[PDB]
């Protein structure tokens, strides 16, 4: 019966391929062929933040466009003030192999995690006046790749054991678990309404999940190597993916098909971080050749280059009002561009 | 305005306190050496770690030689795939690679792992300290027969022992021949690439060796010496 199951799977894959071929009416380039080019985009460094001792692995903006969180492999978590470059807090971590960090929308809690397979939560508004550990979430069998906040009481986690999870912070238990990937999940991004979320794995695939029911609705393919960056379009009906084959792609959700690809001949190194802008017209992506590129999503022609970092770029971030772009690289420096 | 300055003064004093603490932390952080331990299940990498220790998933070890502190890590709470979490250890002083020499059918896997580590994009500037374990088992294997290394490697029949060898006081020539043949196999691929950016240090060890800490100390001293030669324009 196993051979029959394989034949049935192949036949249904053929039917799916025929359906996706039927859906593809016209190319994105043909529709976006007359719009004005963005032009030359030259940003300059406005603030340089120093104080970290080792390479920076992740960062996140607060929901005020003023406060920032940075994580480095030296084992420290620094909360800055971008306007005056004043360090607001410094937190020593128990484990120095930290791979992600997050900022709660309310602004009272901060989460972190890494190779220890544990998500740690710290409280910022303690009545005493000191940051302290509030709750540790455990249950993952692999390293944490990303973590995002839904409310003050719920969190979403993606691990290297090909699984994602939803946690209720108050009781510290898993409510739902999402499975189905073959390789390690590298990143995730929450929807604007916090009802769906997408995740890309090291099997050259991406999957869309519904938070409440806990099921996989759509899976997208097209890359030929590991996907190591993902985000969400401001509209909430598309997303962008970067892989190790040195090319970016844009995927939709109601068409269930790839839309656009960004590539160049001189680019051999892959992408590490991808972030959008407020309007949805600019795509910022950092590479391993020590700089970042600013692509125009609609035209798929490079419009800007950000240079100045002396090592591999690891993290990108954009404010909620689109007034600053923060880049963190392996040279222990955070740079703000406007 | 009064509130503005009344808050800026507090912000400045807090920043000064944090900066002082950060400098104090940097002083300690800059004087500690980090090492990453790699090997296979058959290889007794833990037992040497236990020996130096006596002398969450991630095993941690701290030891001290000549008032210099060394920190060793062991990642074992993950899956077989390791092409993503190994990029974290790119600023490590040196990688301690443990190899099983007694088993022949597992030697090709160790050679392939060593070759993959050698040619990595993010591991081209990190030296590797090679520990060939299980010398007694290899000696018992070759001496008693019933197992021919020629079957696994047909280049063992046209191999002659190099002259610049230092056999132990009491030892059969065949044992020395095979033992140095394994090291020659591992060192053949270590010299094809690498423009003097890293070097492989080979050593022979057993299950009762109590001298690995000094070996690592000397190798780290040589690595730091090379880095200082490059840094101080002495080349």
């Amino acid at each position, epitope marked *: 019966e196993l051979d029959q199951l394989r034949q049935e799977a192949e036949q249904l894959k053929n039917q799916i391929r025929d359906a996706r071929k039927a859906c593809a009416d016209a190319t994105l380039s043909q529709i976006t062929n007359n719009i004005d080019p963005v032009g030359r985009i030259q940003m300059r460094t406005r603030r340089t933040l120093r104080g970290h001792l080792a390479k920076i692995y992740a960062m996140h903006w607060g929901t005020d466009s003023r406060l920032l969180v940075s994580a480095s492999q030296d084992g420290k978590l620094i909360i800055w003030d971008s306007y005056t470059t004043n360090k607001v807090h410094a937190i020593p971590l128990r484990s120095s192999w930290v791979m992600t960090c997050a900022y709660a929308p309310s602004g009272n809690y901060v989460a972190c995690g890494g190779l220890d397979n544990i998500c740690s939560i710290y409280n910022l508004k303690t009545r005493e006046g000191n940051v302290r550990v509030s709750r540790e979430l455990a249950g993952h069998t692999g390293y944490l790749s990303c973590c995002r906040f839904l409310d003050d009481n719920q969190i979403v986690t993606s691990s290297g054991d090909t699984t994602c999870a939803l946690w209720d912070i108050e009781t510290g238990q898993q409510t739902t678990t999402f499975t189905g990937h*073959t390789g390690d999940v590298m990143s995730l991004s929450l929807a604007p309404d916090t009802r769906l979320f997408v995740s890309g794995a*090291c099997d050259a695939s991406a999957k869309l999940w519904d938070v409440r029911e806990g099921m996989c609705r759509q899976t997208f393919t097209g890359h030929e*190597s590991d996907i190591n960056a993902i985000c969400f379009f401001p509209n909430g009906n598309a997303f962008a993916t970067g892989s*190790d084959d040195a090319t970016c792609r844009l995927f939709d959700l109601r068409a269930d098909q790839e839309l656009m690809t960004y590539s160049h001949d001189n680019i051999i190194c892959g992408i590490t971080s991808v972030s959008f802008s407020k309007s949805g017209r600019l795509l910022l992506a950092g590479y391993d050749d020590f700089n970042c590129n600013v692509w125009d999503a609609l035209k798929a022609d490079r419009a800007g280059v950000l240079a100045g970092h002396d090592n591999r770029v690891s993290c990108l971030g954009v404010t909620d009002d689109g007034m600053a772009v923060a880049t963190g690289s392996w040279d222990s420096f955070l740079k703000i561009w406007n | 305005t009064e509130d503005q300055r009344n808050e800026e003064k507090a912000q400045r004093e807090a920043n000064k306190k944090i900066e002082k603490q950060l400098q104090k932390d940097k002083q300690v952080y800059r004087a500690t050496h980090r090492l990453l331990l790699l090997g296979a299940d058959n290889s007794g990498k833990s037992t040497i770690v236990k020996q130096m220790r006596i002398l969450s998933g991630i095993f941690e070890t701290k030891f001290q030689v000549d008032k210099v502190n060394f920190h060793m890590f062991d990642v074992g709470g993950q899956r*077989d795939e*390791r092409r993503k979490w190994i990029q974290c250890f790119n600023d490590v002083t040196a990688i301690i690679f443990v190899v099983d020499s007694s088993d022949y059918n597992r030697l*090709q*896997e160790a050679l392939n792992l060593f070759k993959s580590i050698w*040619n990595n994009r993010w591991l081209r500037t990190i030296s590797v300290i090679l520990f060939l374990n299980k010398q007694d088992l290899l000696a018992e294997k070759v001496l008693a027969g019933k197992s021919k290394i020629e079957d696994y490697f*047909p280049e063992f029949a046209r191999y002659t022992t190099p002259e610049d060898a230092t056999p132990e006081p009491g030892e059969d020539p065949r044992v020395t021949r095979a033992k140095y043949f394994i090291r020659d196999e591992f060192l053949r691929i270590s010299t094809a690439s690498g423009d003097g950016r890293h070097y492989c240090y080979p050593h022979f060890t057993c299950a009762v060796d109590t001298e690995n800490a000094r070996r690592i100390f000397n190798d780290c001293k040589d690595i730091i010496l090379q880095m200082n030669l490059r840094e101080y324009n002495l080349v």
Partner: nanobody
Amino acid sequence: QVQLQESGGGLVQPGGSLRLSCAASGFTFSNYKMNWVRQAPGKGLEWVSDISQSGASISYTGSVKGRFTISRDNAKNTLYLQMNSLKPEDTAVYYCARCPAPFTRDCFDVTSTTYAYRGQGTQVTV
């Protein structure tokens, strides 16, 4: 979608010959190093041979050093394994394996319990 499909196989006797062909689809064929692996009953996966992007560098294991031959064809995106003088230690499932990253001289995971880019395999018996 990445696809690597084996072919060939059959029943032979000690001292026979049979060529194995792997077809590929879904990626550029010349940027990736390729390997041959086999899995025989009672043990785990093992490595056999590898070939580079162009066709110059070639490596075997000792147990098959003087017997088998590898080849690759970029025009037809095919991987060939010539196999002769068989001995009762070759019955296994044969997977052709891709290197995860392009334009690199090394890659880590080719022989793992679960690997993304592999083939179903073919069974050959002596």
